[PDB]
Amino acid sequence: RECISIHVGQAGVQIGNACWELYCLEHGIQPDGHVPRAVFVDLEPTVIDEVRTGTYRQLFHPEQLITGKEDAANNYARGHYTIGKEIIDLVLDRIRKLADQCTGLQGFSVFHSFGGGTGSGFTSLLMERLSVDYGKKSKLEFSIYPAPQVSTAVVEPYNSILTTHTTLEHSDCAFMVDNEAIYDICRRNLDIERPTYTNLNRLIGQIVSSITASLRFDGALNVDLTEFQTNLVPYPRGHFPLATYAPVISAEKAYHEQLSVAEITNACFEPANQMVKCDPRHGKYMACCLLYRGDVVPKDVNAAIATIKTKRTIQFVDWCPTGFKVGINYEPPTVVPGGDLAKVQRAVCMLSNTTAIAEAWARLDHKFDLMYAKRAFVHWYVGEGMEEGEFSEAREDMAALEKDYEEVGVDS
Amino acid sequence: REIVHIQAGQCGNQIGAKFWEVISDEHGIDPTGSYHGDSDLQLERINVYYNEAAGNKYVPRAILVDLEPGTMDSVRSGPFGQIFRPDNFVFGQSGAGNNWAKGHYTEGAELVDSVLDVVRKESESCDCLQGFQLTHSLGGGTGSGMGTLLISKIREEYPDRIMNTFSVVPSPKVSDTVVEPYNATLSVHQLVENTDETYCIDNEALYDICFRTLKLTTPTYGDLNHLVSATMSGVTTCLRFPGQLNADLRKLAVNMVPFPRLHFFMPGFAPLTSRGSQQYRALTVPELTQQMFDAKNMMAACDPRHGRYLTVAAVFRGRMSMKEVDEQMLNVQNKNSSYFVEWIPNNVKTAVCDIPPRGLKMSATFIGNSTAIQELFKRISEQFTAMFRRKAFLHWYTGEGMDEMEFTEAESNMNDLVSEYQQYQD
Amino acid sequence: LHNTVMDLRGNIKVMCRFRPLNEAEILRGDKFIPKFKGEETVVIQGKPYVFDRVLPPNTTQEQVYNACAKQIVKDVLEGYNGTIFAYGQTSSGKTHTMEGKLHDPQLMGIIPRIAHDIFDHIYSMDENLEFAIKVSYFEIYLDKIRDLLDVSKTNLAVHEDKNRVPYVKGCTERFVSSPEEVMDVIDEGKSNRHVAVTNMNEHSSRSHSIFLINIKQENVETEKKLSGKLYLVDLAGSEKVSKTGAEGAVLDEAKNINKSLSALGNVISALAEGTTHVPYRDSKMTRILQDSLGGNCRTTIVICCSPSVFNEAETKSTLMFAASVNSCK
Ligand SMILES: CC(=O)O[C@H]1C(=O)[C@@]2(C)[C@H]([C@H](OC(=O)c3ccccc3)[C@]3(O)C[C@H](OC(=O)[C@H](O)[C@@H](NC(=O)c4ccccc4)c4ccccc4)C(C)=C1C3(C)C)[C@]1(OC(C)=O)CO[C@@H]1C[C@@H]2O
Ligand SMILES: Nc1nc2c(ncn2[C@@H]2O[C@H](COP(=O)(O)OP(=O)(O)OP(=O)(O)O)[C@@H](O)[C@H]2O)c(=O)[nH]1
Ligand SMILES: Nc1ncnc2c1ncn2[C@@H]1O[C@H](COP(=O)(O)OP(=O)(O)NP(=O)(O)O)[C@@H](O)[C@H]1O
Ligand SMILES: Nc1nc2c(ncn2[C@@H]2O[C@H](COP(=O)(O)OP(=O)(O)O)[C@@H](O)[C@H]2O)c(=O)[nH]1
Ligand SMILES: [Mg+2]
Ligand SMILES: [Mg+2]
């Protein structure tokens, strides 16, 4: 029934504090109410401390807040092997102590930031140690994969080609939200050149609320977590769909809010609104899980979608007749009291697997090579319990992820 | 986390006074007083530079190494001079001769053990050690020789903790000493092989940047020092603050050093506007990158425009949009694709603290790893040969128990170091 | 075709040597994974060509020695440099190829054979040549040069020669004028080599070994001194830290040494094939063997490999070393 969550890496923790905020906010549980149902991991104390100093301070147990005073290191190796190792046990312990206390759970919603040290590496083995300790569950990892041109870390790819290959054979469904492609939404669909990280977080903090929160919440067309991976992954590769939200209108500027279904659903497939720089440049969808929430008439959907199924310029895979999982919830969304999110009475958090990422992975793989081609910051990992193996052998890994996402599509 | 500063030589020392003059105020620590901190955040992370004893006396955890009493006795007899626990003063009343050899093999080699002693008392302080900060000048005895030894020993004692080095590489135009390239070439040698992050500052790159970027007409040393200390605060201490995207020595190290040499950087501060007038506030952000990335404004002597970059780390510290930050960095990376090296898709390492420099609204330290610094070790290396060839003031070295093969060694080493760095400019 | 791509001809490649399985392990758990094709391709998974030469699990010690070292020894006696590198993890066959058993008429390795050939020319061709065979044996452990003879020095330094090329000064050298004294140097150095306490069968090398044979020959009539250096470099083992679980042992310490030295490796063949000059003077290993990495191409890399669930790791790395050169036409 439940779904634990492990927010790993400063980012996964910032986003965590955010997604965790939106929660109580739409459940009437102020600062000090019940008890969360997740944990927080980081090898840099000062960040988890922000959850220990700032807002939502006492809504957590100093037990579900793991820290390694030591060093973060923007390098996979160190975070996965060398350092990150020391903490893992302890980490697990909570996701085994928190996993017990419950009643027939469904899985762990993992929150990490692909291209980091504590986020890429660590998790790599966290999800790793999970796939074995609970192979019998769902492993949906919600990632924030590398901005297409606006990356931060100098190494980023090293850290992301490595978190992909190690987690690939362990996740159930990996959701992806592109940090940059979300900015566009903040520039083009909300207008603000002042987007603090605290915003992107409010956003995913939204799209995510549509996943677990409301879905695990009764409705006219419930959709379990398992449901996802089933209706969402055509193949064992921990396939990565993309998150998209519909009423991303500004709560100040424009106001046409009352944008009946027929509109908000069409607003999902236009590439300028998908929290991912993977513009459907060719990527044929192969399965979409249209999660609606608020006042929505099933016919409105079983029509708004029909209209789409016949737009053709939206070309769905061949081997897939119908790939539209319509998830209907009741309670409308719940916007921050005064952030910058419109606040409509219905939304569409549609996520999907698109042959599109054939790109995004490509463009991120290429990156890697360029540097590896010169070993660049390699000495930083080797000296951290890794080898020419793990790199070269994780490169070959993704290689067959560029072929995979190519074969499962583009061909009939 | 933590670190333990090291004031090698007079310069490195003189600067200590300025690095601590600053940092303290950037942490509300009065002379011997405690934390008067205008805020409450300038305390949760202080540890990085102090120690708890009394309850109002957080003492800087640095080392003051020097073979010339008068110096430390000027730093200890002035302003903040009375905050260092006397135990910190590792003096060498000997003749602090201006010889690299006199402070690395003969005179300094003695005072070393009585230093390492303390560098251990401070390291084994508490919690977890990160690395050590090292200030000095590569143009003298107690600086290049004895300080370059202090590290060679440190790096044998904890090849785990990092080693940032703040070197005052011998300014071009005019040398404030004569053997300079001797004391220098010999210390850079030791650097390229122990510390793993070096920030080279040039007394004349400063003047310039201090007499034209600060209409300042009488730039006393105190100033230069002050400007420098401003950068080393943005680096360390800063990142030991919260941030949307924070880093720390390692990130900085693990994102800036593609190849083990250790490589040297060139720090640059952001808001560098003259007092009254200039107080233009054009600091939205494009103004900071405008700054940081220009030629002038690079504490180094060389000009970036004269050689690609391998890595860059804009360590900003003041509330801004992870969008207008992450964005700007890009155009910058495209307007100058020419010089920014290619085999690194994203050279830049954007870092973002929150709280800014006490009295300012928005700043951003720049730590550049450009191939341009090739044209400096060249300089140094040249000066050597031109004088080595004739063994100029060599008797002051050998006569101190040195080797004719020692000088050969260093030059070559550091000379090769020039070579390599070009391997990427191409 | 395919010949033009041999642009790597840099010979500085790395001949593959598979060790055979013994009857006790054919049906224990260790089985063949190496498919051989011809005498130069090895198919492990997906792999359509290998490189220059693959020695099968049917190739003699003598056979490996002829192809790999015999020429290098010949050139060294004329006053040139040569390097033979060795690599392969635990139970791959390194100990068996380099030394084997110290006195075995055909089971003996590389170092006892070179020693036999050296003293077969000496006293048969000395009538104007005065030979002095000097051997030196040192390890690189925690990137410090530990001399393995006399009194162990926990660090030892390089200095530079007449040309500004570094060499290991102070390395304890000794005369050897018959084969026995060479064996006695090996016994002495191995007894202080850092070996992980496993089971008696396994020999987990945590320290890289450099055996120097310095062929000094002096000419009696006015012509001067020659000094060919044969560096026999026995690389320490490489072990996948991920699988084994280094918590705290000389596993973590070895992982840093083996990775730093293998990485420098990668750049050195790549430079020995086609690059501008680069990571010399970076590590002590590189400082000891530099003159050889630039001239008399004789740095034969002999990597081992035994079929099984294991050894596939170090074998793989041995193949990834000289796999790129000219591509193509
Ligand atoms: C009224 C007002 O706003 O005054 C400003 C000011 O006028 C200006 C000109 C300051 C001023 O700085 C200088 O004039 C200067 C003097 C010698 C060497 C270098 C600089 C200032 O003195 C410096 C001072 O800086 C700080 O307070 C930072 O926290 C800074 N602190 C120190 O350097 C410091 C100085 C004395 C004692 C202890 C610390 C800092 C910077 C980076 C990391 C840590 C701390 C500031 C904003 C000002 C004054 C006071 C006039 C500027 O410098 C800095 C480092 O902020 C020079 O260009 C900038 C722009 C500022 O607006
Ligand atoms: N959406 C969103 N992205 C974030 C947030 N914080 C960081 N990121 C992104 O995630 C990545 C940053 O990871 P870091 O903060 O450097 O590291 P970490 O993953 O927390 O772990 P360490 O490297 O060990 O500190 C970058 O790509 C950021 O753009 C956040 O609050 N929201
Ligand atoms: N060709 C061969 N014939 C007979 N025995 C062999 C042969 N090659 C290897 N062996 C034996 O198999 C084992 C592997 O020996 P060595 O001890 O040669 O391994 P490595 O040196 O491969 N091991 P390691 O150092 O731990 O990484 C030893 O017991 C050898 O005596
Ligand atoms: N920025 C700066 N440079 C200094 C200071 N003091 C000496 N220097 C420089 O250091 C060099 C001289 O070395 P010095 O510090 O006297 O050596 P030592 O005292 O014998 O170790 C000259 O290039 C000076 O410009 C200082 O307080 N600030
Ligand atoms: Mg973090
Ligand atoms: Mg062996």
Side-chain angles (χ1 to χ4, degrees), chain A, chain B, chain C residues 1-67 69-170 172-296 298-329:
Chain A
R1 180 206 300 184
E2 282 180 65
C3 177
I4 296 183
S5 31
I6 44 192
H7 310 80
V8 67
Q10 170 178 71
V13 170
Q14 313 190 63
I15 181 192
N17 197 81
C19 143
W20 229 252
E21 174 165 49
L22 192 74
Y23 275 3
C24 76
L25 181 56
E26 73 192 316
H27 274 171
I29 288 181
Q30 298 156 295
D32 298 296
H34 176 186
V35 166
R37 341 205 284 277
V39 310
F40 292 99
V41 198
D42 189 7
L43 315 184
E44 202 185 23
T46 301
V47 189
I48 301 303
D49 259 55
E50 296 311 299
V51 181
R52 286 180 167 177
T53 289
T55 330
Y56 298 74
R57 200 188 74 69
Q58 255 297 296
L59 189 59
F60 305 86
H61 283 40
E63 306 158 298
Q64 43 182 282
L65 284 159
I66 273 62
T67 68
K69 65 176 173 292
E70 298 163 308
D71 327 59
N74 276 186
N75 82 322
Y76 173 75
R78 180 164 169 60
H80 180 105
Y81 296 68
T82 273
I83 183 165
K85 232 304 171 186
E86 274 181 48
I87 319 304
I88 200 300
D89 278 288
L90 179 53
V91 188
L92 271 198
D93 246 314
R94 300 296 173 297
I95 66 191
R96 286 162 62 193
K97 246 180 171 57
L98 239 179
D100 223 300
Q101 155 187 168
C102 60
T103 355
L105 66 163
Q106 185 62 282
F108 338 79
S109 62
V110 173
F111 286 101
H112 74 309
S113 303
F114 251 51
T118 297
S120 63
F122 177 91
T123 339
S124 295
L125 63 49
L126 180 73
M127 285 232 67
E128 209 283 69
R129 267 232 168 187
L130 293 172
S131 297
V132 186
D133 202 302
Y134 309 71
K136 188 189 198 170
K137 300 245 170 259
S138 279
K139 286 134 281 161
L140 277 67
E141 70 196 69
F142 206 127
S143 58
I144 288 173
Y145 137 2
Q149 289 185 58
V150 193
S151 82
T152 294
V154 189
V155 291
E156 173 119 298
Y158 274 164
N159 302 310
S160 49
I161 285 301
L162 286 174
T163 321
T164 197
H165 131 293
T166 193
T167 206
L168 190 55
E169 315 298 61
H170 293 231
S171 196
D172 283 40
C173 197
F175 293 115
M176 311 187 296
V177 139
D178 191 316
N179 190 9
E180 166 161 44
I182 282 184
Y183 275 150
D184 300 313
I185 308 170
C186 305
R187 183 239 305 280
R188 306 171 54 186
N189 286 193
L190 191 34
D191 197 294
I192 27 181
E193 306 288 49
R194 184 262 179 196
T196 307
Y197 255 160
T198 205
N199 285 317
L200 309 182
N201 296 313
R202 301 190 151 302
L203 196 38
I204 341 303
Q206 190 64 64
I207 183 288
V208 177
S209 178
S210 88
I211 302 311
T212 302
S214 68
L215 205 37
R216 291 268 129 153
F217 167 2
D218 301 60
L221 205 55
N222 284 301
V223 199
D224 190 304
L225 281 188
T226 7
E227 297 249 320
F228 287 69
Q229 64 189 201
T230 313
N231 286 268
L232 272 193
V233 335
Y235 305 100
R237 308 305 284 199
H239 278 194
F240 333 53
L242 336 173
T244 301
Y245 198 85
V248 287
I249 170 263
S250 42
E252 275 234 322
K253 253 93 194 201
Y255 269 142
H256 182 296
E257 320 137 355
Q258 287 273 47
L259 200 39
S260 75
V261 176
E263 301 78 75
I264 64 175
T265 292
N266 184 13
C268 279
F269 302 85
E270 50 181 30
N273 211 81
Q274 41 184 61
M275 314 202 286
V276 98
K277 185 81 174 182
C278 191
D279 323 296
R281 170 178 174 173
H282 73 286
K284 302 173 164 32
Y285 285 81
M286 43 192 116
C288 325
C289 181
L290 283 151
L291 293 178
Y292 289 63
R293 61 188 322 177
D295 290 308
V296 185
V297 171
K299 199 250 184 302
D300 281 342
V301 206
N302 217 287
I305 281 177
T307 214
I308 313 301
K309 189 60 182 181
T310 51
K311 236 172 179 176
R312 282 306 191 167
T313 314
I314 181 185
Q315 183 179 46
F316 273 83
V317 188
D318 242 306
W319 48 255
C320 190
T322 68
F324 265 93
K325 212 292 143 181
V326 176
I328 292 177
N329 292 324
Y330 198 95
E331 184 156 306
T334 308
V335 175
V336 179
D340 281 304
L341 344 172
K343 171 48 187 173
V344 190
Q345 298 221 317
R346 79 179 101 209
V348 172
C349 28
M350 93 92 56
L351 32 75
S352 71
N353 196 176
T354 70
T355 294
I357 300 292
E359 286 300 68
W361 281 144
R363 296 293 155 56
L364 192 98
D365 173 356
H366 187 283
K367 249 169 179 48
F368 186 99
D369 291 315
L370 289 190
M371 295 172 315
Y372 188 64
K374 288 185 178 181
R375 306 287 134 168
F377 324 76
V378 156
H379 84 289
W380 276 124
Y381 300 100
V382 193
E384 310 301 301
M386 289 265 289
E387 323 86 303
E388 178 259 51
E390 254 307 61
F391 288 74
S392 281
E393 317 263 274
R395 176 55 186 76
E396 286 184 59
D397 190 325
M398 274 213 107
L401 192 49
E402 161 204 6
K403 306 186 192 306
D404 165 297
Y405 266 177
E406 184 106 74
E407 292 178 58
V408 185
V410 184
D411 206 59
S412 57
Chain B
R1 309 190 190 209
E2 295 174 51
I3 301 180
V4 311
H5 177 242
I6 291 185
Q7 322 192 314
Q10 174 193 45
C11 171
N13 204 180
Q14 292 261 298
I15 290 177
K18 318 308 173 187
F19 162 66
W20 294 104
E21 244 180 62
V22 184
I23 241 191
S24 57
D25 148 297
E26 178 190 49
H27 273 294
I29 278 163
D30 299 293
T32 300
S34 63
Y35 180 67
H36 273 47
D38 316 300
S39 62
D40 353 298
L41 185 72
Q42 298 180 49
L43 187 67
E44 301 182 295
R45 211 93 160 73
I46 46 172
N47 305 314
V48 181
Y49 286 131
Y50 302 68
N51 278 312
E52 304 182 304
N56 162 81
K57 308 170 187 181
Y58 290 154
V59 291
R61 190 164 40 198
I63 309 181
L64 322 206
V65 212
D66 211 319
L67 319 154
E68 181 196 309
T71 302
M72 296 198 282
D73 286 60
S74 70
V75 167
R76 78 168 81 200
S77 67
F80 300 68
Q82 303 184 305
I83 187 176
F84 303 68
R85 295 286 83 174
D87 322 63
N88 284 179
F89 307 117
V90 171
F91 57 1
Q93 192 163 54
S94 314
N98 192 186
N99 210 41
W100 188 90
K102 200 166 178 187
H104 196 301
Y105 297 69
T106 307
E107 306 303 355
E110 68 185 350
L111 190 56
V112 183
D113 302 325
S114 67
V115 177
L116 303 190
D117 194 311
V118 208
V119 332
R120 296 185 195 178
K121 176 187 182 175
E122 300 293 54
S123 59
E124 309 279 300
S125 62
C126 245
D127 213 53
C128 182
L129 172 72
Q130 168 91 317
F132 328 69
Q133 314 273 321
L134 179 62
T135 80
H136 64 314
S137 73
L138 288 35
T142 15
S144 55
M146 183 221 242
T148 207
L149 174 59
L150 282 13
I151 50 98
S152 301
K153 288 286 70 177
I154 295 311
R155 253 270 201 162
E156 180 195 320
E157 182 56 54
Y158 342 65
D160 262 278
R161 321 306 178 177
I162 32 274
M163 277 302 292
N164 298 53
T165 286
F166 283 90
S167 78
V168 177
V169 170
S171 4
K173 48 179 68 176
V174 168
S175 293
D176 303 307
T177 281
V178 200
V179 286
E180 193 95 68
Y182 271 166
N183 317 307
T185 285
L186 291 191
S187 52
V188 56
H189 184 37
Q190 239 76 34
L191 300 173
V192 84
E193 287 275 60
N194 290 323
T195 234
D196 58 282
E197 286 169 300
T198 338
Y199 314 83
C200 2
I201 308 173
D202 310 353
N203 303 306
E204 107 254 295
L206 267 44
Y207 288 164
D208 149 284
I209 301 172
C210 185
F211 124 79
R212 73 135 68 179
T213 308
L214 271 62
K215 308 176 184 178
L216 195 49
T217 304
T218 58
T220 303
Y221 257 124
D223 305 20
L224 287 218
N225 285 38
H226 174 315
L227 149 149
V228 163
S229 33
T231 291
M232 77 177 333
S233 26
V235 186
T236 306
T237 165
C238 170
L239 266 183
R240 301 327 160 70
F241 269 155
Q244 313 292 23
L245 185 87
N246 65 66
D248 73 273
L249 292 198
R250 290 168 191 290
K251 308 246 302 182
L252 277 65
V254 193
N255 272 289
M256 300 215 301
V257 295
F259 304 96
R261 291 336 301 258
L262 121 57
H263 293 196
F264 319 62
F265 319 139
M266 324 196 291
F269 198 71
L272 237 9
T273 67
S274 51
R275 196 225 171 158
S277 66
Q278 197 54 12
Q279 150 234 172
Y280 226 83
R281 332 269 230 187
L283 299 180
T284 300
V285 156
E287 301 90 354
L288 279 64
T289 72
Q290 156 71 58
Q291 192 105 59
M292 318 195 313
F293 276 93
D294 193 340
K296 37 289 175 191
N297 213 230
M298 286 299 275
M299 294 180 177
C302 63
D303 28 79
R305 207 182 188 191
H306 236 158
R308 313 266 189 302
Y309 282 72
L310 303 197
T311 271
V312 170
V315 188
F316 303 80
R317 65 200 306 281
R319 257 264 158 53
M320 61 212 298
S321 143
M322 262 49 265
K323 148 77 178 183
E324 59 177 44
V325 184
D326 267 299
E327 164 177 299
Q328 216 60 199
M329 306 313 272
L330 180 57
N331 299 176
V332 187
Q333 274 203 65
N334 295 293
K335 281 187 184 176
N336 312 288
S337 69
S338 191
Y339 41 68
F340 230 138
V341 101
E342 299 166 63
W343 44 279
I344 305 187
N346 192 156
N347 315 292
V348 196
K349 202 296 159 289
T350 276
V352 166
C353 166
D354 266 313
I355 163 172
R358 212 315 212 170
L360 201 52
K361 170 175 183 176
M362 175 191 293
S363 69
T365 314
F366 176 78
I367 314 181
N369 183 179
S370 52
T371 54
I373 212 177
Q374 160 182 294
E375 283 210 298
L376 170 119
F377 289 150
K378 249 180 186 59
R379 200 62 175 189
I380 307 285
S381 203
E382 158 63 62
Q383 305 189 321
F384 205 78
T385 48
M387 77 168 32
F388 190 50
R389 174 49 190 171
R390 304 303 205 75
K391 314 226 167 305
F393 319 82
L394 204 152
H395 90 293
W396 285 119
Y397 290 82
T398 296
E400 283 300 305
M402 188 95 319
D403 330 300
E404 189 83 62
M405 183 54 215
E406 190 45 39
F407 286 59
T408 290
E409 182 169 300
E411 165 149 59
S412 303
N413 172 187
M414 186 253 289
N415 197 60
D416 126 301
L417 161 61
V418 157
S419 149
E420 171 265 82
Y421 245 136
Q422 191 158 294
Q423 312 284 77
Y424 300 112
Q425 208 166 48
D426 250 286
Chain C
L1 291 172
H2 182 203
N3 233 254
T4 297
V5 180
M6 262 142 212
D7 256 320
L8 188 147
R9 68 182 181 183
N11 191 91
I12 34 158
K13 332 223 170 131
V14 292
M15 299 163 153
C16 192
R17 189 260 169 174
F18 288 81
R19 73 94 157 173
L21 310 166
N22 41 275
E23 292 288 8
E25 70 188 39
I26 295 169
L27 304 174
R28 182 202 303 147
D30 308 302
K31 304 180 196 306
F32 300 106
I33 52 180
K35 294 88 172 178
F36 310 115
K37 293 182 183 180
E39 58 113 64
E40 77 187 294
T41 304
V42 61
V43 179
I44 313 180
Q45 305 183 72
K47 185 161 295 306
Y49 189 59
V50 176
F51 38 89
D52 301 287
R53 194 171 287 195
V54 171
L55 295 174
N58 196 29
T59 307
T60 193
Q61 296 271 298
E62 194 197 83
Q63 289 295 110
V64 174
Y65 181 72
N66 296 317
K70 214 166 190 69
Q71 292 175 354
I72 296 180
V73 176
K74 195 75 208 73
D75 283 292
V76 167
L77 300 152
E78 279 73 274
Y80 287 133
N81 292 337
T83 299
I84 302 180
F85 281 105
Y87 181 99
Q89 299 260 357
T90 333
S91 303
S92 67
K94 268 215 301 272
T95 302
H96 191 65
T97 301
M98 282 272 262
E99 44 161 294
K101 279 72 179 64
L102 306 180
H103 298 88
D104 187 315
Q106 68 182 357
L107 298 176
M108 65 164 49
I110 296 180
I111 303 180
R113 290 184 195 285
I114 302 180
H116 182 73
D117 282 295
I118 280 180
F119 296 118
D120 297 308
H121 295 293
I122 287 180
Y123 63 76
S124 293
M125 295 300 306
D126 293 323
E127 70 287 285
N128 286 302
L129 305 170
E130 166 182 282
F131 270 78
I133 301 180
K134 285 155 171 87
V135 305
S136 308
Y137 192 12
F138 48 79
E139 61 174 32
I140 289 180
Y141 174 74
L142 306 171
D143 205 15
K144 297 181 166 178
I145 312 180
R146 305 184 64 260
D147 194 9
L148 297 165
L149 299 180
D150 296 1
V151 178
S152 305
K153 309 158 197 168
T154 295
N155 182 62
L156 184 66
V158 305
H159 277 244
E160 304 169 344
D161 62 48
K162 299 190 186 173
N163 282 352
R164 298 175 175 265
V165 169
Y167 76 101
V168 189
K169 204 169 196 158
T172 304
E173 297 180 347
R174 62 183 305 263
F175 303 101
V176 301
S177 69
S178 59
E180 291 174 356
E181 283 184 287
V182 193
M183 309 305 155
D184 303 315
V185 176
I186 300 180
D187 291 307
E188 182 168 61
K190 281 263 172 166
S191 66
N192 297 308
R193 191 168 174 176
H194 292 74
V195 293
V197 180
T198 58
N199 64 82
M200 290 186 78
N201 168 241
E202 271 80 327
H203 173 63
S204 307
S205 38
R206 302 311 183 175
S207 41
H208 298 212
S209 299
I210 295 180
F211 197 86
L212 249 169
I213 302 180
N214 178 90
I215 300 172
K216 176 158 178 305
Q217 50 175 224
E218 232 295 310
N219 180 24
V220 77
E221 294 87 1
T222 61
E223 288 180 71
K224 310 294 288 179
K225 290 168 183 45
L226 291 161
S227 183
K229 285 71 155 180
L230 218 190
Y231 293 94
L232 292 161
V233 180
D234 191 65
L235 277 70
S238 292
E239 53 164 81
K240 181 139 318 181
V241 179
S242 183
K243 285 166 180 185
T244 53
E247 291 180 8
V250 62
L251 184 51
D252 204 81
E253 296 168 59
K255 185 68 174 180
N256 306 130
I257 307 180
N258 302 348
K259 278 266 60 172
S260 52
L261 292 170
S262 70
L264 283 153
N266 196 275
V267 188
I268 290 180
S269 280
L271 180 52
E273 293 177 350
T275 291
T276 63
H277 302 294
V278 56
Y280 297 117
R281 294 279 293 261
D282 289 25
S283 73
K284 285 168 177 241
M285 188 61 81
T286 41
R287 268 196 98 144
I288 302 180
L289 344 125
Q290 165 187 136
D291 196 18
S292 295
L293 281 319
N296 279 338
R298 327 187 199 277
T299 301
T300 287
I301 297 180
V302 176
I303 62 193
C304 296
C305 27
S306 85
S308 300
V309 298
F310 178 78
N311 292 349
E312 204 239 79
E314 183 280 335
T315 316
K316 265 170 157 192
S317 303
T318 312
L319 298 140
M320 293 301 293
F321 208 65
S324 252
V325 198
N326 206 42
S327 260
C328 33
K329 333 143 252 242

